[PDB]
Amino acid sequence: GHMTIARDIVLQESIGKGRFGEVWRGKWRGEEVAVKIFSSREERSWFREAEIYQTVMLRHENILGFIAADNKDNGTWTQLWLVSDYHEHGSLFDYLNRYTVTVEGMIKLALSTASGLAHLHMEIVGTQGKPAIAHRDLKSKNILVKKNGTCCIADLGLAVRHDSATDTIDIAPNHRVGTKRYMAPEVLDDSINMKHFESFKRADIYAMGLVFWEIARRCSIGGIHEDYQLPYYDLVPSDPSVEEMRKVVCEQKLRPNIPNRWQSCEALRVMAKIMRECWYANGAARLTALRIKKTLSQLSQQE
Ligand SMILES: COc1ccc(-c2c(-c3ccnc(NC(C)=O)c3)[nH]c3cccnc23)cn1
Protein backbone atom coordinates (compact mmCIF):
# COMPACT_ATOMS: atom_id res chain seq x y z
CA GLY A 1 0.00 0.00 0.00
CA HIS A 2 1.26 3.47 1.03
CA MET A 3 2.51 2.68 4.57
CA THR A 4 6.14 1.49 4.90
CA ILE A 5 6.23 -2.25 5.84
CA ALA A 6 9.05 -4.82 6.37
CA ARG A 7 8.04 -7.06 3.40
CA ASP A 8 8.82 -4.15 0.96
CA ILE A 9 12.27 -3.41 2.49
CA VAL A 10 15.53 -4.91 1.13
CA LEU A 11 18.53 -4.82 3.46
CA GLN A 12 21.80 -3.62 1.83
CA GLU A 13 24.51 -3.03 4.47
CA SER A 14 25.25 -3.78 8.21
CA ILE A 15 25.67 -0.35 9.87
CA GLY A 16 25.73 -0.94 13.63
CA LYS A 17 24.47 -2.77 16.73
CA GLY A 18 22.56 -1.57 19.82
CA ARG A 19 22.31 -3.48 23.15
CA PHE A 20 20.27 -6.16 21.32
CA GLY A 21 19.10 -4.91 17.90
CA GLU A 22 21.37 -5.34 14.84
CA VAL A 23 21.27 -2.24 12.58
CA TRP A 24 21.08 -2.26 8.77
CA ARG A 25 20.71 0.20 5.93
CA GLY A 26 17.80 -0.87 3.69
CA LYS A 27 15.86 0.25 0.65
CA TRP A 28 12.12 0.90 0.64
CA ARG A 29 10.60 2.03 -2.73
CA GLY A 30 13.95 3.54 -3.86
CA GLU A 31 14.49 5.38 -0.53
CA GLU A 32 17.13 4.58 2.13
CA VAL A 33 15.76 3.59 5.63
CA ALA A 34 17.53 2.28 8.81
CA VAL A 35 16.34 -1.02 10.21
CA LYS A 36 16.92 -2.40 13.71
CA ILE A 37 16.44 -6.19 13.90
CA PHE A 38 15.67 -8.18 17.03
CA SER A 39 15.23 -11.94 17.40
CA SER A 40 12.02 -13.54 18.91
CA ARG A 41 13.81 -13.88 22.29
CA GLU A 42 14.46 -10.07 22.32
CA GLU A 43 10.67 -9.34 21.89
CA ARG A 44 10.49 -7.30 25.18
CA SER A 45 13.28 -4.90 24.06
CA TRP A 46 11.77 -4.53 20.54
CA PHE A 47 8.24 -4.03 21.96
CA ARG A 48 9.39 -1.46 24.55
CA GLU A 49 11.22 0.69 21.94
CA ALA A 50 8.23 0.45 19.52
CA GLU A 51 5.94 1.46 22.45
CA ILE A 52 8.02 4.58 23.25
CA TYR A 53 8.25 5.65 19.56
CA GLN A 54 4.48 5.33 19.15
CA THR A 55 3.76 7.72 22.08
CA VAL A 56 1.21 10.35 21.04
CA MET A 57 2.81 13.68 19.89
CA LEU A 58 6.42 12.33 20.19
CA ARG A 59 7.57 13.42 16.67
CA HIS A 60 9.99 16.37 16.68
CA GLU A 61 12.81 17.43 14.31
CA ASN A 62 15.33 16.47 17.06
CA ILE A 63 13.95 12.94 17.75
CA LEU A 64 14.78 10.14 15.22
CA GLY A 65 11.88 9.79 12.74
CA PHE A 66 10.13 6.51 13.50
CA ILE A 67 8.58 4.66 10.54
CA ALA A 68 7.28 1.30 11.78
CA ALA A 69 7.46 -1.75 14.07
CA ASP A 70 6.89 -4.87 11.96
CA ASN A 71 7.53 -8.65 11.85
CA LYS A 72 9.25 -10.45 8.94
CA ASP A 73 9.01 -14.26 8.64
CA ASN A 74 11.72 -15.55 6.26
CA GLY A 75 10.18 -19.04 6.30
CA THR A 76 12.40 -20.39 9.14
CA TRP A 77 12.32 -17.73 11.85
CA THR A 78 10.65 -14.40 12.55
CA GLN A 79 12.62 -11.16 12.77
CA LEU A 80 11.27 -8.23 14.83
CA TRP A 81 11.88 -4.96 13.03
CA LEU A 82 12.11 -1.26 13.93
CA VAL A 83 12.35 1.09 10.91
CA SER A 84 13.44 4.75 10.96
CA ASP A 85 14.73 7.58 8.81
CA TYR A 86 18.34 6.89 7.63
CA HIS A 87 21.01 9.53 8.37
CA GLU A 88 24.19 9.23 6.24
CA HIS A 89 26.43 10.80 8.97
CA GLY A 90 25.42 8.17 11.53
CA SER A 91 25.92 8.99 15.21
CA LEU A 92 27.22 12.23 16.81
CA PHE A 93 30.08 9.96 18.05
CA ASP A 94 31.01 9.03 14.43
CA TYR A 95 30.60 12.65 13.19
CA LEU A 96 32.84 14.07 15.96
CA ASN A 97 35.54 11.45 15.29
CA ARG A 98 35.59 12.48 11.58
CA TYR A 99 35.19 16.24 11.68
CA THR A 100 35.80 19.42 13.57
CA VAL A 101 32.99 22.00 13.73
CA THR A 102 32.79 25.80 13.52
CA VAL A 103 31.28 27.89 16.39
CA GLU A 104 27.97 27.77 14.36
CA GLY A 105 28.28 23.98 13.90
CA MET A 106 28.82 23.45 17.64
CA ILE A 107 25.78 25.62 18.61
CA LYS A 108 23.60 23.78 16.03
CA LEU A 109 24.57 20.37 17.48
CA ALA A 110 24.13 21.40 21.16
CA LEU A 111 20.91 23.37 20.53
CA SER A 112 19.28 20.59 18.45
CA THR A 113 20.30 18.02 21.16
CA ALA A 114 18.90 20.32 23.96
CA SER A 115 15.63 20.82 21.93
CA GLY A 116 15.04 17.05 21.42
CA LEU A 117 15.66 16.40 25.12
CA ALA A 118 13.36 19.31 26.18
CA HIS A 119 10.63 17.80 23.90
CA LEU A 120 11.06 14.27 25.41
CA HIS A 121 11.06 15.70 28.98
CA MET A 122 8.02 18.02 28.39
CA GLU A 123 4.49 16.82 29.07
CA ILE A 124 2.16 18.19 26.31
CA VAL A 125 -1.27 18.54 27.87
CA GLY A 126 -4.32 18.28 25.56
CA THR A 127 -6.70 15.73 24.01
CA GLN A 128 -3.73 14.25 22.06
CA GLY A 129 -1.48 14.45 25.13
CA LYS A 130 2.17 13.52 25.46
CA PRO A 131 3.55 12.16 28.82
CA ALA A 132 6.93 13.38 30.11
CA ILE A 133 9.68 10.93 28.98
CA ALA A 134 13.22 10.40 30.39
CA HIS A 135 15.78 8.69 28.04
CA ARG A 136 18.07 6.91 30.66
CA ASP A 137 20.82 6.26 28.01
CA LEU A 138 21.82 9.58 26.42
CA LYS A 139 25.30 9.54 24.83
CA SER A 140 26.99 10.61 21.60
CA LYS A 141 26.50 7.08 20.13
CA ASN A 142 22.71 7.48 20.72
CA ILE A 143 22.33 10.77 18.86
CA LEU A 144 22.35 10.90 15.03
CA VAL A 145 23.54 13.82 12.87
CA LYS A 146 21.30 14.90 9.94
CA LYS A 147 22.56 16.28 6.56
CA ASN A 148 21.63 19.86 7.71
CA GLY A 149 24.07 19.57 10.69
CA THR A 150 21.39 19.22 13.42
CA CYS A 151 21.00 16.27 15.89
CA CYS A 152 18.25 13.78 16.61
CA ILE A 153 18.04 11.63 19.69
CA ALA A 154 17.54 7.90 19.14
CA ASP A 155 17.59 4.50 21.04
CA LEU A 156 14.60 5.07 23.25
CA GLY A 157 14.38 1.41 24.42
CA LEU A 158 15.40 2.25 28.01
CA ALA A 159 13.07 5.30 28.34
CA VAL A 160 10.52 5.81 31.16
CA ARG A 161 7.14 7.57 30.74
CA HIS A 162 5.40 9.54 33.47
CA ASP A 163 1.73 10.38 34.18
CA SER A 164 1.74 13.65 36.22
CA ALA A 165 -1.89 13.32 37.48
CA THR A 166 -1.57 9.92 39.25
CA ASP A 167 2.27 10.51 39.71
CA THR A 168 3.18 7.09 38.20
CA ILE A 169 5.93 5.70 35.90
CA ASP A 170 4.79 3.23 33.16
CA ILE A 171 7.45 0.54 34.07
CA ALA A 172 9.22 -0.86 37.19
CA PRO A 173 12.72 0.55 36.40
CA ASN A 174 15.90 -1.45 37.02
CA HIS A 175 18.98 0.22 38.53
CA ARG A 176 22.08 1.21 36.48
CA VAL A 177 20.56 0.37 32.99
CA GLY A 178 22.54 2.71 30.67
CA THR A 179 26.15 3.27 29.59
CA LYS A 180 28.46 3.20 32.62
CA ARG A 181 30.70 6.06 31.38
CA TYR A 182 27.67 8.45 31.16
CA MET A 183 25.91 7.40 34.37
CA ALA A 184 25.10 10.33 36.69
CA PRO A 185 26.71 10.38 40.20
CA GLU A 186 23.38 9.31 41.87
CA VAL A 187 23.09 6.36 39.40
CA LEU A 188 26.73 5.26 40.05
CA ASP A 189 26.28 5.25 43.88
CA ASP A 190 22.62 3.94 43.57
CA SER A 191 21.29 6.88 45.72
CA ILE A 192 18.86 7.92 42.88
CA ASN A 193 15.25 8.13 44.18
CA MET A 194 13.52 6.04 41.47
CA LYS A 195 10.02 6.72 42.93
CA HIS A 196 10.47 10.36 41.71
CA PHE A 197 10.38 10.72 37.88
CA GLU A 198 12.19 14.10 38.05
CA SER A 199 15.35 12.06 39.10
CA PHE A 200 15.45 10.38 35.64
CA LYS A 201 15.17 13.77 33.88
CA ARG A 202 17.98 15.15 36.11
CA ALA A 203 20.16 12.08 35.33
CA ASP A 204 19.68 12.69 31.52
CA ILE A 205 20.89 16.35 32.01
CA TYR A 206 24.22 15.17 33.48
CA ALA A 207 24.71 12.91 30.39
CA MET A 208 23.83 15.79 28.03
CA GLY A 209 26.56 17.91 29.69
CA LEU A 210 29.07 15.11 28.94
CA VAL A 211 27.88 15.11 25.27
CA PHE A 212 28.29 18.97 25.16
CA TRP A 213 31.89 18.48 26.30
CA GLU A 214 32.46 16.04 23.39
CA ILE A 215 31.15 18.62 20.85
CA ALA A 216 33.11 21.63 22.34
CA ARG A 217 36.46 19.75 22.04
CA ARG A 218 35.84 19.60 18.27
CA CYS A 219 34.99 23.32 17.94
CA SER A 220 37.84 24.67 15.75
CA ILE A 221 38.63 28.44 16.05
CA GLY A 222 41.53 29.58 13.84
CA GLY A 223 42.40 25.94 13.21
CA ILE A 224 42.80 25.29 17.00
CA HIS A 225 40.77 22.40 18.62
CA GLU A 226 41.33 19.28 20.79
CA ASP A 227 41.29 15.70 19.37
CA TYR A 228 38.12 13.56 19.74
CA GLN A 229 37.76 11.97 23.20
CA LEU A 230 34.99 10.23 25.20
CA PRO A 231 34.24 11.84 28.60
CA TYR A 232 36.66 10.55 31.32
CA TYR A 233 39.15 9.25 28.62
CA ASP A 234 41.97 10.59 30.95
CA LEU A 235 40.72 8.86 34.16
CA VAL A 236 39.06 5.47 33.50
CA PRO A 237 39.90 2.54 31.15
CA SER A 238 38.06 1.75 27.90
CA ASP A 239 34.88 -0.21 28.83
CA PRO A 240 34.88 1.11 32.48
CA SER A 241 33.09 -0.68 35.32
CA VAL A 242 30.53 1.01 37.65
CA GLU A 243 33.18 0.88 40.48
CA GLU A 244 35.83 2.62 38.32
CA MET A 245 33.33 5.36 37.31
CA ARG A 246 32.06 5.75 40.90
CA LYS A 247 35.61 6.30 42.35
CA VAL A 248 36.27 9.19 39.89
CA VAL A 249 32.83 10.83 39.65
CA CYS A 250 31.45 10.30 43.21
CA GLU A 251 34.55 9.96 45.43
CA GLN A 252 37.26 12.04 43.75
CA LYS A 253 34.45 14.30 42.35
CA LEU A 254 36.19 14.84 39.02
CA ARG A 255 34.44 15.92 35.85
CA PRO A 256 35.78 16.19 32.26
CA ASN A 257 38.49 18.90 32.01
CA ILE A 258 37.40 22.35 30.73
CA PRO A 259 40.36 23.69 28.64
CA ASN A 260 41.76 27.22 29.11
CA ARG A 261 41.11 28.11 25.44
CA TRP A 262 37.26 27.74 26.04
CA GLN A 263 37.32 30.94 28.12
CA SER A 264 38.66 32.93 25.08
CA CYS A 265 35.41 32.51 23.06
CA GLU A 266 31.90 33.68 24.14
CA ALA A 267 30.11 30.58 22.66
CA LEU A 268 32.72 28.25 24.28
CA ARG A 269 32.34 30.20 27.63
CA VAL A 270 28.50 29.76 27.46
CA MET A 271 28.96 26.00 26.67
CA ALA A 272 31.51 25.60 29.55
CA LYS A 273 29.02 27.20 32.01
CA ILE A 274 26.14 24.88 30.83
CA MET A 275 28.46 21.82 31.34
CA ARG A 276 29.39 22.79 34.94
CA GLU A 277 25.67 23.39 35.65
CA CYS A 278 24.79 19.85 34.29
CA TRP A 279 27.53 18.22 36.43
CA TYR A 280 26.47 18.92 40.05
CA ALA A 281 26.39 15.63 42.09
CA ASN A 282 22.88 16.50 43.25
CA GLY A 283 20.38 16.27 40.39
CA ALA A 284 18.08 18.93 41.99
CA ALA A 285 20.87 21.50 41.44
CA ARG A 286 21.12 20.85 37.63
CA LEU A 287 19.76 23.05 34.78
CA THR A 288 16.57 21.80 33.01
CA ALA A 289 16.65 20.85 29.29
CA LEU A 290 14.14 23.72 28.65
CA ARG A 291 16.48 26.26 30.32
CA ILE A 292 19.51 24.96 28.30
CA LYS A 293 17.51 25.25 25.02
CA LYS A 294 16.56 28.88 25.92
CA THR A 295 20.22 29.78 26.61
CA LEU A 296 21.49 28.20 23.34
CA SER A 297 18.57 29.80 21.36
CA GLN A 298 19.65 33.28 22.60
CA LEU A 299 23.30 32.40 21.76
CA SER A 300 22.42 31.15 18.17
CA GLN A 301 20.42 34.40 17.72
CA GLN A 302 23.36 36.55 19.01
CA GLU A 303 25.74 34.40 16.83
C1 LIG B 1 13.75 2.97 15.58
O1 LIG B 1 14.55 2.52 14.46
C2 LIG B 1 15.90 2.63 14.54
C3 LIG B 1 16.63 2.23 13.40
C4 LIG B 1 18.00 2.42 13.44
C5 LIG B 1 18.60 2.96 14.58
C6 LIG B 1 20.07 3.04 14.75
C7 LIG B 1 20.99 3.62 13.90
C8 LIG B 1 20.86 4.45 12.67
C9 LIG B 1 19.72 5.21 12.44
C10 LIG B 1 19.71 6.08 11.36
N1 LIG B 1 20.75 6.24 10.51
C11 LIG B 1 21.86 5.50 10.73
N2 LIG B 1 22.93 5.78 9.81
C12 LIG B 1 24.20 5.28 9.80
C13 LIG B 1 25.14 5.87 8.78
O2 LIG B 1 24.59 4.42 10.56
C14 LIG B 1 21.94 4.57 11.78
N3 LIG B 1 22.26 3.38 14.40
C15 LIG B 1 22.16 2.66 15.56
C16 LIG B 1 23.13 2.14 16.43
C17 LIG B 1 22.69 1.41 17.53
C18 LIG B 1 21.32 1.24 17.72
N4 LIG B 1 20.37 1.73 16.89
C19 LIG B 1 20.81 2.43 15.82
C20 LIG B 1 17.77 3.31 15.64
N5 LIG B 1 16.44 3.15 15.64
UniProtKB/Swiss-Prot annotation:
Record's catalysed reaction(s): L-threonyl-[receptor-protein] + ATP = O-phospho-L-threonyl-[receptor-protein] + ADP + H(+); L-seryl-[receptor-protein] + ATP = O-phospho-L-seryl-[receptor-protein] + ADP + H(+)
Role according to the record: Transmembrane serine/threonine kinase forming with the TGF-beta type II serine/threonine kinase receptor, TGFBR2, the non-promiscuous receptor for the TGF-beta cytokines TGFB1, TGFB2 and TGFB3. Transduces the TGFB1, TGFB2 and TGFB3 signal from the cell surface to the cytoplasm and is thus regulating a plethora of physiological and pathological processes including cell cycle arrest in epithelial and hematopoietic cells, control of mesenchymal cell proliferation and differentiation, wound healing, extracellular matrix production, immunosuppression and carcinogenesis.
Known cofactor(s): Mg(2+); Mn(2+)
Lineage: Eukaryota, Metazoa, Chordata, Craniata, Vertebrata
Active site positions, chain numbering: 137 (proton acceptor)
ATP-binding is among the record's keywords: yes
Shown residues in whole-protein numbering: 200 to 499 of 503
GO term, biological process aspect, one: ventricular trabecula myocardium morphogenesis
Name of the molecule in the record: TGF-beta receptor type-1
Cross-link (Glycyl lysine isopeptide (Lys-Gly) (interchain with G-Cter in SUMO)): 195
Regulation: Kept in an inactive conformation by FKBP1A preventing receptor activation in absence of ligand. CD109 is another inhibitor of the receptor.
Cytoplasmic-facing ranges: 4-303
Organism: Homo sapiens
Disease affiliated with this protein: Loeys-Dietz syndrome 1: An aortic aneurysm syndrome with widespread systemic involvement, characterized by arterial tortuosity and aneurysms, hypertelorism, and bifid uvula or cleft palate. Physical findings include prominent joint laxity, easy bruising, wide and atrophic scars, velvety and translucent skin with easily visible veins, spontaneous rupture of the spleen or bowel, and catastrophic complications of pregnancy, including rupture of the gravid uterus and the arteries, either during pregnancy or in the immediate postpartum period.
Subunit structure: Homodimer; in the endoplasmic reticulum but also at the cell membrane. Heterohexamer; TGFB1, TGFB2 and TGFB3 homodimeric ligands assemble a functional receptor composed of two TGFBR1 and TGFBR2 heterodimers to form a ligand-receptor heterohexamer. The respective affinity of TGBRB1 and TGFBR2 for the ligands may modulate the kinetics of assembly of the receptor and may explain the different biological activities of TGFB1, TGFB2 and TGFB3.
Any one of the GO CC terms: bicellular tight junction
Enzyme Commission number(s) from the entry: 2.7.11.30
